[PDB]
Amino acid sequence: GLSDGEWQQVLNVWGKVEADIAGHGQEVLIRLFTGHPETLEKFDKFKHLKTEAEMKASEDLKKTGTVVLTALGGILKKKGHHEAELKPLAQSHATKHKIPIKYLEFISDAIIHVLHSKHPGDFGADAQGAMTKALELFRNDIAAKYKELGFQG
Ligand code: HEM
């Protein structure tokens, strides 16, 4: 999917996320949830939050933030050689959580948003381009598995 120059960009940008996984993961989910509230309904432990302060105030959300971005970071470091770590991911989001691939689109957008926000001016045009394709690759490999399963919705 990507060139090596491009993976290079991806991994350079991921290095900013690794300096504060917890803080980045928090703001990614908050951006996802405040923007697309129907997404909050896919989590029974976040059902209760109703405001963004409460969200910001939840330590559990930070925890969930760290799990999601730790797992993502592990896939990105495989430079597209992720059949092994994505299958399980794809199977559980489809059969167990029942996550439409649109929500995966939404968080992909939420990551890009958050990176600009926390790093205004040092998330260059090339960087945005390498990162965007990486997330698209991710999402595409998941949609193929969703298709197998007929996870129609
Ligand atoms: C960037 C893409 C994402 C990654 C890497 C990711 C990763 C993970 C991981 C590692 C887990 C725990 C292990 C498992 O259940 O497989 C998890 C659970 C879960 N994910 Fe995802 N996830 C992503 C996107 C989403 C999105 C977009 C939603 C819904 C809007 C979502 C909803 C859930 C739910 C409901 C659980 C179970 C939560 C709990 O009770 O702990 N995930 N995810």
Curated annotation (Swiss-Prot):
| In-chain residues carrying the UniProt-annotated modification Phosphoserine | 3
Domain of life of the organism encoding this protein: Eukaryota
Chief location of this protein within or outside the cell: cytoplasm
Q: Which GO terms describe its molecular function?
A: heme binding; metal ion binding; nitrite reductase activity; oxygen binding; oxygen carrier activity; peroxidase activity
Q: According to its UniProt record, where is this protein located?
A: Cytoplasm, Sarcoplasm
User: Taking every annotated instance into account, which residue ranges of this chain make up the domain Globin?
Assistant: 1-147
Name the coiled-coil region(s): none
The Gene Ontology CC terms held by the record are: sarcoplasm
Q: Where does heme b bind?
A: 93
Span of the signal peptide: none
Q: Which family does it belong to?
A: Belongs to the globin family.
PANTHER family referenced in this protein's UniProt entry, alphabetically: MYOGLOBIN
Q: What name is this protein filed under?
A: Myoglobin
Q: Which organism is it from?
A: Equus caballus (Horse)
Q: Name the gene.
A: MB
